[PDB]
Amino acid sequence: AYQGFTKLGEREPLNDIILWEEITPTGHSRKEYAPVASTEYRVGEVLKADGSKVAAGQEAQADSVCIVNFYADLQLSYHGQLKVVGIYRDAELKDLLKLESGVDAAAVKSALKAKGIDFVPTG
């Protein structure tokens, strides 16, 4: 390119952050959201109750952790699903978290830990 380098992009995070979850016939720790407006979800981003990403100052209202890769242009997930699913109940994820700008992790982790979501150290 005119800038000297062309980077076609990085592979989107894989749905591997889940280490343990309450496995039930209908799914216990997973809830589906309505994709809000033109929003690009990825694996490991913390969502609010309505479905939008947690922003700075809104840490206490951390509702779940996204575990699907959604595309605003297609209005479809990377598995061709109409909804976006997050983890909001008893489960144990990895430290990989796609936080927003200016949002502290500790408040997000404590809010999620209140609901029974645990994070394991990652090397």
Partner: protein, 366 residues
């Protein structure tokens, strides 16, 4: 037998003809480093995947707690390629009446002119290829004009490594800098195999070689030796190896497990500015020596080759979607017997898939 000077009626002799062919350098081209990779499309991609490892932290037994490891990282990059086109024409009015140099009264034909034009075109493309290969060895592929085509360090997200030998200081540790350069390749190769850092090529310019072979430490070390190598290096020809484009034997020097080869290659562009092959873009202090160290072919093995050159087809009416070629030459005749047209095409890019291994070398101190 041709007309004498001063008189059109007496005769003289035309013994012969002397020619001054310009110097051409082909050391990097003749090294065989850049394996040929013919290409069909105009761009080629590449996948970059890597992982990392860390140390376990001790965790108590009764409180059953553990650790986890981060997943891999997969990216992708793309490469554009340079297109070189060169046109030359033959006309009847540069053949009619004109006399063949070195001959008394015989006339130039179309065959000799065509042969010399084709030879010049091929030589120009060869020197351009050598310059491009040297630039790719430097880690940044800059066109002769100066436009950037592929910056390998930003594309692969690596930083250039340069080593200051400090040849001026008599107390400098040449062994320490040599060891640093040797271990850099082993550390930064990251191929997953076992690396031998002694298998590298160190190509330096005249000044760096002169300062290196005249360092008090090196000379005093080699003078107090009774081996044939030391005798040759001190009082003997320092020109083993070679078969350079100009000289029959290149200067090279054995100090550690590595060798230092002096490469004098340089070319000029249309603007007239010279392009020294062994140089650093920016440095010109004249009194500082520069060099370039790159891994040998037999260091990472043939399975992991990092020096490749691509070739893609020219945009002609029947060469589309075919394997690339080193050079295309086309014959086109002017209408109304007005002449002959020549076109030469070459669509290439030399690149390095592990730019971290390309290490720069300087003679001054940081």
């Amino acid at each position: 037998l041709t007309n004498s000077e001063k008189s059109r009626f007496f005769l003289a002799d035309l013994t012969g003809e002397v020619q001054s062919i310009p110097n051409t350098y082909g050391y990097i081209s003749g090294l065989g480093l850049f394996r040929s990779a013919p290409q069909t499309q105009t761009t080629f991609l590449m996948d970059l995947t890597d992982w990392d490892i860390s140390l376990l932290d001790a965790v108590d037994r009764t409180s059953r707690k553990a650790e986890t490891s981060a997943p891999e990282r997969v990216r992708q990059i793309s490469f554009p390629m340079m297109y070189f086109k060169e046109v030359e024409s033959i006309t009847p009015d540069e053949i009619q009446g004109v006399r063949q140099p070195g001959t008394a009264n015989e006339l130039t034909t179309e065959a000799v002119v065509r042969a010399k034009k084709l030879m010049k075109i091929r030589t120009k493309f060869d020197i351009t290829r050598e310059f491009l290969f040297m630039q790719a060895l430097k880690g940044k592929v800059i066109d002769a004009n100066g436009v950037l085509y592929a910056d390998l360090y930003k594309q692969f997200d690596v930083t250039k490594k340069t080593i200051y030998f400090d040849l001026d200081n008599p107390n400098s540790d040449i062994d320490a800098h040599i060891e640093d350069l040797r271990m850099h390749m082993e550390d930064e190769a990251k191929t997953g195999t076992v690396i031998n850092g002694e298998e590298i090529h160190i190509v330096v310019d005249r000044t760096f070689f002169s300062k290196l072979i005249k360092h008090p430490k090196i000379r005093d070390a080699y003078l107090a030796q009774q081996t044939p190598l030391a005798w040759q290096q001190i009082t003997g020809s320092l020109r083993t190896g070679g078969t350079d484009g100009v000289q029959a034997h290149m200067n090279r020097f054995y100090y550690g497990g590595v060798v230092f080869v002096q490469y004098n290659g340089k070319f000029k562009d249309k603007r007239g500015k010279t392009h020294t092959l062994v140089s650093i873009d920016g440095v010109s202090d004249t009194n500082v020596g520069v060099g370039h160290a790159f891994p040998n072919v037999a260091m990472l093995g043939e399975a992991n080759n990092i020096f490749e050159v691509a070739y893609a087809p020219c945009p002609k009416m029947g060469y589309a979607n075919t394997l690339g070629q080193e050079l295309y030459v086309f014959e086109y005749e002017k209408d109304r017997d007005e002449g002959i047209d020549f076109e030469a095409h070459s669509y290439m890019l030399p690149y390095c898939t592990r730019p971290q291994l390309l290490v720069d070398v300087r003679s001054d101190a940081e």
